[PDB]
Amino acid sequence: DVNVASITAFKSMIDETWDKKIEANTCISRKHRNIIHEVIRDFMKAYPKMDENKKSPLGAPMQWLTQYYILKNEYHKTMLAYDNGSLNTKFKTLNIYMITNVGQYILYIVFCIISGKNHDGTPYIYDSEITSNDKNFINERIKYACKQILHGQLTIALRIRNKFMFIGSPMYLWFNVNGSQVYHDIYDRNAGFHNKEIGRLLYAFMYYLSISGRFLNDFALLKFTYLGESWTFSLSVPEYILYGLGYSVFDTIEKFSNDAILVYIRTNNRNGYDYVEFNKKGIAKVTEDKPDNDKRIHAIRLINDSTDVQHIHFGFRNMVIIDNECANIQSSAENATDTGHHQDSKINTPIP
């Protein structure tokens, strides 16, 4: 299953943005984020499982991490061959240190991910490591890969002095990864990344994952699954988390309580957002049409009464959804606001 639509859309995005200089507030638009999100998800879907004769006994998702699988992934092959190979040729000119333009940033980060390559050129996992039963060894390699996607983007942000460019590390790259360790490994060692005008969506993504681990066990209130990769939540779930991890509100969503959730799915005609509400335990299935890339949203406001006041702002309207006006994107409790609801319509391990 090769979704060529996302390939075509990706190529056109790169054409539009190739020569667009990254400035202080520059961010990736809703449309472009949604294209990026589709590309990573469509890459995964094209070769979604390991082969029985070349399988990790740990259950590490080597189909998305190794050349053995990626080189036979038909989405990867079609993407790298598209338009006479033009995107692959562009990609090979790039590295972290020279990137200055939006389309260079997007192409480099994305093509590294869907090629299974670290920024230093090494594969995330070597083919000879696929079958390893050494959990600590494999865990360390995946943690490195996950961190370097984010660290490389922070290095770019600090050099250019940019606030809002952001592509996440997809969920499969968090195999046994401790989000508090990722956060502290990076932030404890570079004071420049703390500047409030630098790397704010990267910060928001990592900060949330530093306080809310992937598997919350009995504290989990929600669970998402895509192609066997699951994640749990007990707070509101900002769009920067769902976009960053590669999850969709059209994925398998399970509720473990009867708290209300508001699942935001699309922009409307009133400078607002449309959402579906769910309350009961079990599967929460959005049956509305999938919006186009220009309009699609992925965000959840969780409503309960035991959420700590220090965490309530993750569900605030203008933080839980990424503003399409780059300069006004919210990224922490200092700037999160919960105003504007009259424009919206109802359609119907770290532990917090």
Residue numbers in the entry: 17 to 364, 382 to 385
Passage from the reporting paper:
Additionally, an inter-domain disulfide bond is present between Cys43 and Cys342, consistent with our previous mutational analyses. Consequently, the A261-397 structure appears to present a novel fold with two distinct domains. In our A26 crystal structure obtained at neutral pH, His48 and His53 are located in the helix α2, which is strategically sandwiched between N-terminal helix clusters and C-terminal beta strands. Thus, our crystal structure of A26(1–397) protein strongly supports that His-cation pairs involving both His48 and His53 within the N-terminal region most likely contribute to structural alterations by increasing electrostatic repulsions under acidic conditions. Our results show that the NTD of A261-397 is highly positively charged, and the CTD of A261-397 is relatively negatively charged.
Vaccinia MV employs a highly conserved eleven-component fusion protein complex to mediate virus fusion with cells, but how it functions remains unknown. However, the acidic pH of endosomes triggers conformational changes in A26 protein, which is subsequently released from the viral fusion protein complex, resulting in viral and vesicular membrane fusion.
